[PDB]
Structures are given as structure tokens and as C-alpha cells.
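hiii so my PI (J.) wants the whole complex modelled not just the main chain, which honestly fair. so below is everything: two entries, each one labled with what it is. i double checked the lines twice but i was tired so who knows lol
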Amino acid sequence: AFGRRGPEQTQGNFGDQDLIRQGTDYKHWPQIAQFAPSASAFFGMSRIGMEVTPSGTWLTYHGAIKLDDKDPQFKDNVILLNKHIDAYKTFPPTEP
Amino acid sequence: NVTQAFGRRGPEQTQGNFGDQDLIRQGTDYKHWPQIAQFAPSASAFFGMSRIGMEVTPSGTWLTYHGAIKLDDKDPQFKDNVILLNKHIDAYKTFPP
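here's the output for the full assembly
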């Protein structure tokens, strides 16, 4: 969908092979998706910008979401997210 | 409204910078909100397209994100969409002191 995971600025870096294979069918997808911002939160929280490069006009965004560390699921949420962040570094190269 | 929910618009890295005085007062009731909202990623797009990190700092644990969404210049609505987004980006610079 958004291409191969990898280290480049134009690549996404999130997702292990199960999330890649299964997408929204992945057993822990709801537990991940809860951290995704609503449209209101995305435009309300983020630093939004616009840039014009040789490939077109881009709407840039960045920000940071504070995890609720009083949530009983906090420690497990952190483990789950960490599992997927830069997971590609762990992949067999013959993957897929 | 928007600023009670997501804090003041401003220049700092921890603050949001998007929305003019009408957007921030009206929120999702703002007349042009759906035309803006079309640009916000789905959960799948947010996790699939962004660069995601995790940072543990004195204030807490934060899921960081950044990315860029290509605007479709072939779309007939492109001209109006970029003018609208541009209006709201850093609009707080025009707010009186």
C-alpha cells in the first residue's frame, strides 16, 4: 500500500511481517489503531506545513502522542508498538 | 474548542500550528472542515505511511510521527484545497497581540 518498510525519509518504518501480511486482519490491529489520531486530533495536534518540491506539493506533518501511563495496558501497549517500530531491520532478506 | 482540546496554536515544537480564528472557535462545525479533513490519514495510512518512533523523556512516553502527503495536482479541487490549507497553516501569526 505505502510500499516497503525501510529507513528512507519517503518510506514508512512501522510494521512487522504479520501486520504486513494481514493488514487490518492482524490480531493486535485494534490495539495499534487506538493510537491513530482522528481527523480533528491530526490537524489539532500536529505541526502542519506545505512544501513544493520537484515531485509536487506536499502536506507535511509531525507530532507526538503521549501514551497514558496510568492505563493498565500501558506496559503492553509500549511492547506492542516497539515490536512494529523498525521491525523491518529484523526481517529475512528473502522476505517475502 | 480546538485550543481547549489540543492547546494554543503557536510556533513551539510541542504546539499545533494549524487553524485560523474561525476554525479554532468552531472545530468540526467549521464550514470547510470536511474539505480539510479529507487530508487526515486513516489509521491504516497513519501507521503505513509515517515514520514512527518512541521517546521516553522526563514528561513521559511519546509515540512520535512524521510524514508527508502528496497533494494530487490533477484533482480539479487542488487549487482551492491548497489555498484553504495554506490559510490555516500558521494562521496564529495573524492573531492580534
